[PDB]
């Protein structure tokens, strides 16, 4: 019965150092401008964030 265990070691780099602020996923995190969002979540919140589709 120790609380020293069941805790996650701090990590300053790697896939486990970044999680989506909406999901917690460890995969395709977008850090282009500090967004820290999944490629799935960005597709959903781009209109809310103000991004549009001029091209």
């Amino acid at each position: 019965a120790k609380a020293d265990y069941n805790k996650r070691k701090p990590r300053k780099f790697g896939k486990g150092a970044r999680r989506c602020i909406r999901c917690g996923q460890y995969g395709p995190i977008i850090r282009i401008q500090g967004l820290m969002l999944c490629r799935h979540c960005f597709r959903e919140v781009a209109p809310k964030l103000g991004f549009r589709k001029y091209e």
Partner: protein, 195 residues
Amino acid sequence: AIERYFIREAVREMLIDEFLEKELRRAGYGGLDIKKTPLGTKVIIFAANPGYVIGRGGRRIRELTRILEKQFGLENPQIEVEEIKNPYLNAKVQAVRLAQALERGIHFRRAAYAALRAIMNNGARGVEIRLSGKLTGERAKSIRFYQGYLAKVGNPAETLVSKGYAQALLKLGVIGVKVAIMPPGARLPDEIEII
């Protein structure tokens, strides 16, 4: 850079909107507006039921102020609540209300027709309501009820038409509700009149 500030503000606002949408579902949440003041910030919440938002004695509103200050990093926030400009034109509010009715237990066809006729009567160019899920059996289906004039493809469709989506959780699964409303006074590029 300078765009980092815009990105951070947009992300914070989107997080605030999502959390408020989750928390105040029964209050007919219709959005929020955030204004910056030299002493802090003011958040105005659009709601059709201020009673639930403020609560009895303001416990909910003080808790919301505390959580907005502490978890969202907003500095000195003050919260105000005010009415929806048009609940029958706000697509998100209508979708949430239809999902709540489905959860309550009204028949899907009756509830959809009631919402359609209410929105039609309260003034609109066109309405479309799509219900998708395990309706009438274990095999999923999608049913659409439409009235009036609506646009689906193009810039006028993306701009004028207001869309909303809701999820109704029954005892058998989730049902998706999509509501698209064309507000009155919207003029298509085709519509040209002689002076």
